[PDB]
C-alpha cells in the first residue's frame, strides 16, 4: 500500500464520490433523505435535522461527513477484498 | 431499621431463618453423633 | 420526530424499609391485609404484575428496568458462584492435562450422612459430583489455564453483581428514567445492535484472537498449561504472539490497508472440527465473531435517532401493506411502544426458538474443546436448551394473550394486520386443528400400525426401512448439498460446517467427537411426530391468544380477564376458557413435545453417532438399534426406556445414587401433580371445612381462614409439579445413563 | 516458542503432575477440613483459605507451597501472581 | 451546627447531640427508635469499655516482656498457656460470674433504679440513680463524676478513647492474622523502618 | 462562531448553551447537558464541574509526563529519576523506581491524602459554604469557598492572579484543560502503540514526520515489549 496505489485510489475515489453525492442532494443525507418522502425519485428536507449546525453553504454536517466516510470505507472494503478471497 | 426488623418478622423470612437454624442443628448432631439407627441403651 | 435524549426524575421514590414491613403494598386488595389463606398466593402471584399494580406506564417501565437490573445481578451471582466453585471445589487443573479421561467436576459434598459417596471417582486424584454444564470446556476454550484466573473472574462477577444491584437501585430510587426514555426504540436497536451485540462480539473476537487462540494453540500442540505464557504476555508481547502466528509480525498495517488476506493464519474458514480437541477451530470462531461484530455494527446504524440519516420503524411498518392485509402493519408501532407484554411475547418467542437453535447447533458443531467427546455435557446442554426454548415459547404465548386481553385497543387496530387475524381466527384454528389431527393420525398410525404388524408377525407389512420405505428424501438431499458445499457452493470453505452431513468421522481419544448422521425411516417418523407435537402446541397457544377476548361461547371474555377459571357450568360447561388455561394445556403439550425431541436426540446419538472407534469400525453406545427399533412404540419402550434405565435404577451404592433418588422423587412429584390436576377446589374446600372443625374443636383455629387453592392456582400447581416431575425424571435418567456409559 | 515449551513440558512433567495432584487434593480437602480437623473453630475464625495461604493446612497449604514451585523464570507463575490483594473475605 | 462525623453533611435527624460522642454518624439509621437508641448506646459503651480493657491487657504483658520485668506470651499465645485450670472450667466460672453481673447490668438497663443496692450486704451504690451505663456510685471510687460539667466531657473522653480502642482491637486481630506476632512487636517493627516493614511494605498484599 | 465549533451545536444544544458558562462554544452534539430531564450524574452542573476537574488533572498529568523526561534528557534532573511517565512506578511490570517507601505504601499514602482532599472538595460541590464552618484544624478560614464549586477564591487563589480579566482567564483555563485532556489521551495512546515516552514520540515526528507517524507505527505497534 502507498499513496497512488490502487487500494488508496479506490477508497479516495469512493469517499469523494459519496460525499459529493450527499452534499449536492444526490444521496440521502442528514438534512435531506427519504424520511417522510413520497416516492423513490424524490427526497425531502428533514425538519428535525434542519439547521443541526454547519458552516457549509449547502448545510453539510459532520454527521453527514461521518456517514459518507463510513459508507465509503464499507464499499471500498467490499471492492478491494474482492480478488483477495483464496478460492 | 425497625420496619426492616418487622419485615424480618414476616412469615417467609422467619420460616427460612428457623428452618436454616434447625437444619444446622440437625446436621451438627448428625456430625457429632452420626449414624444413629436407634437410641442406645 | 422527537429528539432522542436522556430524561430522568431525580429521587422519585425514597429508599426505605417501610414497604418491606408491610406485605402487599403494591396492590390495594392485598394492602389491607390477609382475610383468608388465598391472600398469600395472591400476593406471590401478582408480585411481578406491574401492570395491575399501577395504571401509569412510566412507573411500570421503571419497575421493569430495575427488575431487569436485579435479574442481571442474580445471573452475575450465579456466574460468580460457578467460577468460584470451578476454582476451589473442582479438578479443572487436573482435567486440563487429561481432558479425555478425567471427568469434569466442580461440586464436592460435605461428608455428613453418608452422602460422601456422591463424591465420585472423577479422576485427577479428586472426588466430587461430576458436572455436565460444560463449564470446564468453556473455560478451556476461553484460554483459562489456572484456578487463579477462575477465582479472579468469579470475584469480578460478584463485583459486577453488586454493581448490577446498585444500578437497579439507582435507576429506581435515584435516577429513574421517564417514559419517553424507554420509548426510544430506534435508539435501543441502534445500541443493542452496534453496542451490545456488535461491540460485544468485537470484544470477544479480540479476546479469542489475543488470549484464547495462542493458549489453545499451545494446548493443541501439547504444551503443559502450567508452562504456557500468561495471556497478558501474549496480548502485549507481539513477538511472542507472532511466534505462534506469523501474521502478527505485520501489526495492524494489513488491517488498515485492506490487506486482510495476510491474517489468514489466525482468521480462517476451515470448517469442521479440530481433530485433537473435537471442537470448532478457534481461528474459525475468532473470524466468526469478528464478522458478526462487523455485521451488527453496520446493522446498528439503521434507525434514525437524532440525526436525519436512518430509519423510522413506524414508517417502515406502515408502508408494508397489501391487497390481502388491509392497512397492513399500521398501528403495530403503537402496540410495541406502549405495551410491555407485546414486546415480551415477541422476545420470549424468539429467545425460545433461539435456545432451541443453540442446542441443535452445539451438538452438531461442538464449539468447545473436548465437548463432543464428553457425551454427558453434550446431551445435558442439548436437553437443557431445548427445555428452556419450549418454556420461553409457552411464555411468549402467555404474554401475547396478556397483551391481547389487557393492552389491545380496537380503536388503534381497525383494519391492520392484527385485526384481520382476529376476524378470521375461526379459519386459522380450524385449519390448524385439521392439520393437527391429520399429523397425529398419520404419524401415530405409522407407529401403531407397526406395533400391530409386528405383534401379528407381519414385519413385511411394517413401515420399517426393509418393508415400506418412507425415506426422508428431502432431508437426505439437504445433507448431500451441505456435504458438497465446500466444493461448489462454499468454495473457500476448507470443510463442511458439521461432520453430520457426511464423510470423515471425527474421533478424539477413541471416542467419536462427531459422526455423520443418517436419516432412515425411523428419522422420518420421529420428525413427523415432532411436527405433530409442535403443531398441537401451536394450536393450543394460538387458540388461546386469538380467542383471548371473545368466542362464540363467551363473547364478553375480555372483561373476564386474562386469568379466570371459567364462566360457570352453563353453556354445557365453560371450564378452562381463559387464555391462561390455554397456556396451561399449551405448556403441557410443550412438555410432551420436548420429551420426544430429547428422547429422539438421546437415542439417535447413542445408536448412530456416539461410540468409540477401535480400528474395526464404530462401536456405538447402543449398537445402532435405532434404525430398526425406533419405528415402534414397543421399540421406544423396550430399547430406549427399559434398556437405558438400567444405569439409573442400578445406580444405588455409587456416585449416581443421587440420580436414582431424584429419578424416584421426580416420579413422585409427577404423580403428586396428578392430584392437583385431576381434582377440583370444591372437594378440597369441604375437606378443609372438616379439618377446620377439628381445629376449632381444640381452639387452634387460625386467624387467617384456611382456603382451598383457587381453581387457577390448582391448575398452576398441577402443571408446575407435572413439568417438574417429568423433566427431573428425564434429567436423572439422561444424566445417569450418559455418565455411566460414557 | 512451542518447541521449547514442549521441551520443558517434557523436562518438568513430573513436577507439574505433582502440582496438579496437590491442587486437586486441596480442592477436594476444602470440603473436609472440619471433619478431618484442619480448619476447626479457632483457625477458621477468618477465612480458612487465608489459613491455607498464611497459616498451615494439610492439603490446601501444600498446594499453596508447590503451586509456584519450579515454574518458568522471568514470567510470573501461571498458577499464582506475584502479589494480590487478599481474597474477598478469605473466600 | 455542631461538629459532625463528616463536615457538610447534616447529622442524623434521630441524633440531636444529647449523647456523649454524638457526631451524627448513622447512615444506616440503626438508632431511629429511642428505645432501640437506649439499648444501642449501652452496647457502644459496653463494647468501648471491653475493647479498652482488651487493648490494655493485650499490650501490657508484651510491654513488660520487652522491658524485662517478667516473661509473658502474646495475647493469642496466652490462650494455650497452661494455667491452674483448663479453658473449660475457667470459662465456666467466668460465665457464671458474668451471668450474675450481666443480669444486674441488664436489669439496670430495664430499671435504672434497680441494681443500685447490694443484694448481699445492702450497700447503696447511688440512691435513686437514673443514668444507665454509668453507675458512678457503684464504680466511681475516686469521685471523678461529682460535677455534671466535669462528667459530660469525661463521658466524651471515655467514648472517644473507647471507639479508638475498638478500632485498635480490630487492628490487633487483623495484624496477628496477617503478620503473626503481638501488636507491640508490630509497632516496634514499623517504628524501626516505616519504609521497609508494614502493610504494603513487607509486600504482604 | 468558528469552524469545528458549529459541528456540535444544534437546536437542542443552542437552547441551553447560552454562552456565559466558561468556554461555552455550543459544542454539545449529544443531549447530555439538557437541563430538562436532568438527573444523576448527567446534570449540566456536574458535567461542567467534572470537565473542569478533568482539565486541571490533565494539565497536571501532561506536565508530569513531559517534565521528568525532558529534564532527564537535557540533564536537569537525575537520569534514574527522569523516567518516562509509564515506567516511573505506575506499572511495576513496565517499570519502577526505588523511592523512599514501597510503591504500594506510597499508593496508600497518596490514597488517603486524596481521600481527605477530594471529599472536602465534594462537600463544597454539594454544600458550598459548609467547608469553612467546622473546625478543620484551624484551616477552614481559608477553605470557605466562593459559592461556585469550580472556582473557590480562598487559599487556592493566594496569588490573586487573573483578577483584572477573570472572565478571559476563566476561558483560558477551560481551553487549556481541553487541550491537556487531548494531550494526555494522546500520550497514553502513543505510549500504548509506540512503546516510548511522549517527548521521544514528539522529536521522532519532528525529525522524520513520514517515518514516525501513526500509519508507519502500525507495523511496529509495540516497539520493544517489556512483557
Ligand atoms: C463491485 C465490486 C465487487 C465485486 C467484484 C465483489 C465480489 C465478491 N464479493 Mg464482495 N462486496 C462488494 C463489492 C464487490 N464484491 C461491496 C460493495 C460489498 C458491500 C460491503 C461487498 C460485500 C461482500 C460480502 C460481505 C461478501 C462478499 C463476497 C464476494 C464474493 C461473492 C460470493 C457470492 O456472492 O457467492 C454466492 C453466495 C450466495 C448467493 C449466498 C448468499 C447468502 C446466503 C443465502 C445467506 C444469507 C442469509 C439471509 C437469508 C439473508 C437475508 C436476506 C466475490 C469475490 C463474499 C466473499 O468474499 O466470500 C468469500 C462475502 O462474504 N462481498
Ligand atoms: C452501547 C450501549 C448499550 C448496551 C451495551 C446495552 C446493554 C443492555 N441493555 Mg440497553 N439501552 C441502551 C444502550 C445499551 N444497552 C440505550 C441507549 C437505551 C435507551 C433507549 C437502553 C435501554 C434499555 C432497556 C429499557 C433495557 C436495556 C437492557 C439491557 C441489558 C440486557 C441484558 C443483556 O443482554 O445482558 C447483557 C449483559 C452484559 C453486557 C453484562 C454487563 C451489563 C452492563 C449493564 C452493561 C453496560 C451497558 C451500559 C449501557 C454501559 C454503562 C453505562 C453506565 C455507566 C451509565 C444489556 C446489558 C435491559 C436490562 O436488562 O436492563 C438492565 C432493559 O430492560 N437497555
Ligand atoms: C475489542 C477487541 C480487541 C482489543 C481490545 C484488541 C487489542 C489489541 N490488539 Mg487486537 N485485534 C482484534 C480485536 C481486539 N484487539 C481483532 C478483531 C483483530 C483482527 C483484525 C485484531 C488483530 C490484531 C493484530 C494483528 C494486532 C493487534 C494488536 C493489538 C494491541 C495493539 C493496540 C494498539 O497499540 O493499538 C492502538 C491503540 C490505542 C491507540 C489505544 C490506546 C489508548 C489509551 C488506552 C488511552 C488512555 C489515555 C488516558 C486518557 C490517560 C493516560 C494516563 C492514565 C492511564 C493514568 C491491543 C492489545 C497488535 C498487538 O500487539 O498484538 C499482540 C497487533 O499486531 N490486534
Ligand atoms: C422474560 C421472561 C418472563 C417475564 C418477564 C415474565 C413476567 C410475568 N409473567 Mg410470564 N411466563 C414466562 C416468562 C416470563 N414471565 C414463561 C417462560 C412462562 C411459561 C411458563 C410464563 C407464563 C406465564 C403465565 C401463565 C402467567 C405469567 C404472568 C406473568 C406476570 C406475573 C408473574 C408473577 O408475579 O409471578 C411470580 C412468579 C411465580 C408465582 C412463579 C413461582 C415459581 C414457579 C412455581 C416455578 C418454579 C419452578 C422451579 C424452577 C423448580 C424448582 C422449585 C424448587 C424450589 C422445588 C409477569 C408479567 C402471569 C400474569 O398475570 O401475567 C400478567 C400469568 O398468569 N407468565
Ligand atoms: C396418548 C394419549 C393421548 C392421545 C391419543 C391424544 C389424542 C389427541 N389429543 Mg390429547 N392430550 C393428552 C393425551 C392424548 N391426546 C393429554 C394427557 C393431554 C394433557 C391435558 C392432552 C391435551 C390435549 C389438548 C389440549 C389438545 C389435544 C389434542 C389431541 C388430538 C391431536 C390430534 C391427533 O393426535 O391426531 C388424531 C388422534 C390420534 C392420532 C389419537 C390416536 C388414535 C389412533 C391413531 C387410532 C386410529 C383409529 C383406530 C384404528 C380406531 C378405529 C377403530 C376403532 C373404532 C375400533 C387427539 C384427539 C388437540 C386436538 O384435539 O386438536 C387436534 C388439542 O387441542 N389433547
Ligand atoms: C394413518 C396412519 C396409518 C397408515 C398410513 C396406515 C397404512 C396402512 N395400513 Mg395400517 N393401521 C393403522 C394406521 C395406519 N395404517 C392403525 C392405527 C391401525 C390399527 C391398529 C392399523 C391397522 C392395520 C391392519 C390390521 C392392516 C393395515 C394395513 C395397512 C395398509 C393398507 C390400508 C388400506 O387398505 O387402506 C385403504 C385406504 C384408503 C381407502 C384411502 C386412504 C386415504 C387416501 C389415499 C387419502 C387421499 C386424500 C387426497 C390426498 C385428497 C385429494 C383431494 C383432491 C382431490 C382435491 C397401509 C400400508 C393392512 C396391511 O397389511 O397392509 C400393509 C392391514 O392388514 N393397518
Ligand atoms: C442496561 C444498562 C444500562 C442502561 C441502559 C443505563 C442507562 C442510563 N444510566 Mg445507568 N448504570 C448501569 C447500566 C445502565 N445504565 C450500571 C451497570 C451502572 C453501574 C456502574 C450504572 C450507573 C449509573 C449512574 C451512576 C448513572 C447512570 C445514568 C444513566 C443514564 C445516562 C447514560 C449516560 O449518559 O451514560 C452514557 C455512558 C457514559 C457517559 C460512559 C461512562 C463510562 C462507563 C464506565 C463505560 C463503561 C463501559 C463498559 C463496557 C460497561 C461496564 C459496566 C460494568 C457493570 C441512562 C438512563 C446516569 C443518569 O441517570 O443521569 C441521567 C447516572 O447518574 N447509570
Ligand atoms: C469488645 C471488644 C474487644 C474486647 C477484647 C478483649 C476483652 C480482649 C481480651 C484479650 O486480649 C486480652 C486482654 C488478653 C489475652 O490473654 C486474652 C484476650 C481474651 C484475647 C471489641 C469491640 C470491637 C467492636 C468493633 C470493631 C465495632 C465496630 C463497629 C463499627 C465500625 C460500626 C460502624 C457503624 O455502626 C456505626 C458506628 C454507624 C452505622 O450507621 C454505620 C456502621 C458502619 C454500621
Ligand atoms: C481525553 C479526555 C476526555 C475526552 C472527552 C471527549 C472528547 C468528549 C467529547 C464530548 O463531550 C463533548 C466535548 C461533547 C459531546 O456532546 C460529545 C462528546 C463526543 C461525548 C480526558 C482525558 C483526561 C486525562 C486525565 C484526567 C489525565 C490524567 C493524568 C494524571 C492524574 C496523572 C498521571 C500521572 O501520575 C501518573 C499516573 C504516573 C506519573 O508518572 C505520570 C503522571 C502523568 C503525572
Ligand atoms: C472540500 C472542502 C474541504 C475538504 C473537505 C474534505 C476532503 C473532507 C473529507 C472528509 C473525509 C475523508 C472523511 C472521512 C471519514 C471516514 C470515516 C468516518 C471512516 C469510517 C470507517 C469505518 C466506520 C470502518 C468500519 C470498518 C472497519 C473498522 C473494519 C471493518 C470494515 C468496516 C469498513 C465496516 C475543507 C474542509 C478543507 C474546506 C471546505 C470544502
Ligand atoms: C391437594 C389440593 C388442594 C389442597 C391444598 C391446601 C389448601 C394447600 C397446600 C398445603 C400448604 C403446604 C399449606 C401451607 C402451610 C403453611 C405455610 C404452614 C407452615 C408449614 C409448616 C407445616 C412447616 C387444593 O386446594 C386444590 C384446589 C384446586 C385443585 C386441586 C387442589 C388440590 O389437589
Coordinates of C-alpha atoms in Angstrom, one line a residue, chain D residues 8-20 66:
Chain D
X8 CA 10.2 -28.1 29.2
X9 CA 6.8 -29.8 29.4
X10 CA 8.8 -33.0 28.9
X11 CA 11.5 -31.9 31.3
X12 CA 9.2 -30.7 34.1
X13 CA 6.2 -33.2 33.5
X14 CA 6.7 -35.0 36.9
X15 CA 6.7 -31.8 38.9
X16 CA 3.6 -30.4 37.1
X17 CA 1.8 -33.8 37.7
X18 CA 2.7 -33.4 41.4
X19 CA 1.4 -29.8 41.3
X20 CA -1.9 -30.9 39.7
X66 CA 4.1 -26.2 45.4

